[model samples]
Target: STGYLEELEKERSLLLADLDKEEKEKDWYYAQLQNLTKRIDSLPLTENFSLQTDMTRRQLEYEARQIRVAMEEQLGTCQDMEKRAQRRIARIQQIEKDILRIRQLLQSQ
Candidate 1:
């Protein structure tokens, strides 16, 4: 009669899918940040006419930093979700053990 197992299974699948998508997006952002850093470093900052380029490069770097932070946050969230799923699975196993013990006691009496 315990419904916890079914509910946990459902949530586990959803969380796993969400974690997968978040990880993929995080990898994408990491690659983009690397490319932006390379472009920023290659910019010729000594020329006056290159002011706009400098500004654009710095802006991209800032945006890249922001994206990188977001990616880190998403990764942390996914890790937490994975941990929660592991805990839930462990709890379900314990519940099964308890149920088996109770059944044995009832049959013995």
Candidate 2:
């Protein structure tokens, strides 16, 4: 009886844990930018290949811009999921009401 109530409340904890996981994934994507920067900076340079290297440099800058946009988009996705979780957690009152009301209605039938 009361155990069911406990389980219902546990959804809040589950949602919180899920959001925590989403936050950690976001951190990983953020780290990718740092890794990208370090790797590109360590690229080779040659005295006889300056022109090709310059093209490579410009291409890398565009790639960097694209990566930045992707990171931001993923962050926005994570933050949107976070807001949704928060919203569902805030629906506790209605959820409880529906559970109780449906239980009574079943008994009345």
Candidate 3:
């Protein structure tokens, strides 16, 4: 009976040591979890803010597209005006040659 009691006491001491180790591990894991939670809390609140930012970015992209289209249209108009101006210059040159020819004929007469 005394031998059995000693064996039981030893077993109890071993179980207690194991329990202490497990409690320390639990405390360490809890500390790690708390640190992770704090890190998460420090992050930006991005639910609605991200949505708003995305909308703003899309709006700017849309505006940029519109401006690009307008610029292309204006460039086309300028090209057309330049072509018309070139035609007018050629016509004026022809008219000036005709006037010079008429003046020479009149002067010779």
Candidate 4:
């Protein structure tokens, strides 16, 4: 009956690995956004710079904002996953402990 507990713990460890990976990705996204803002500020208002796909700096700015929204939104999803895994992990421990407690009471009586 408690076999599912093993599977739940397996996923708990997986979540930790994935969470660490997402943290690094989020850090990189934050770092680049800061660098982009600084570089945008350092620019003059005259020259027409060609961005990727022949886009303008104005377009790039818009696209970067889109990325910020998306990545942060995904980060929100990651937090939800963490919440689920942690709650399940704790429940598994509690279930196992109660099983032991009940078996011990039987022996003592």
TM-score top scorer: 2
Q: How many backbone clashes does candidate 1 have?
A: 0
lDDT of 1 by residue, 9-46 (tens): 55556656765675577678769988988888887767
lDDT of 3 by residue, 38-98 (tens): 5544555578677765666566556555654654454344465457446555655565565
Of 2 and 4, the candidate ahead on TM-score is 2
Q: Sort the candidates on lDDT, descending order.
A: 2, 1, 4, 3
How many residue pairs clash in model 3? Answer: 0
Error of 3 at 58 (Å): 24
**Which model is ahead, 1 or 3, in terms of TM-score?**
1
Candidate 4, after superposition: displacement of residue 51 in Å? 17
Best by lDDT: 2
Q: Mark the regions of model 3 whose C-alpha exceeds 4 Å error after superposition.
A: 46-109
lDDT of every model, 2 decimals: 0.70, 0.70, 0.56, 0.66
User: What's the true lDDT of residue 92 in model 2?
Assistant: 62
Q: Taking the tens digit of each residue's C-alpha lDDT, what string does model 2 give over 1-109?
A: 3465556657656767766777787778768767767767876787787887778778777777887778667666656766866776676655677668767876899
* Ten residues in sequence with the least summed lDDT for candidate 4: 47-56
Looking at candidate 2, what is the lDDT of residue 62? 79
User: Candidate 4 lDDT, tens digit per residue, 9-39?
Assistant: 5665665676577668778888878877776
Per-residue lDDT of 76 in model 3: 44
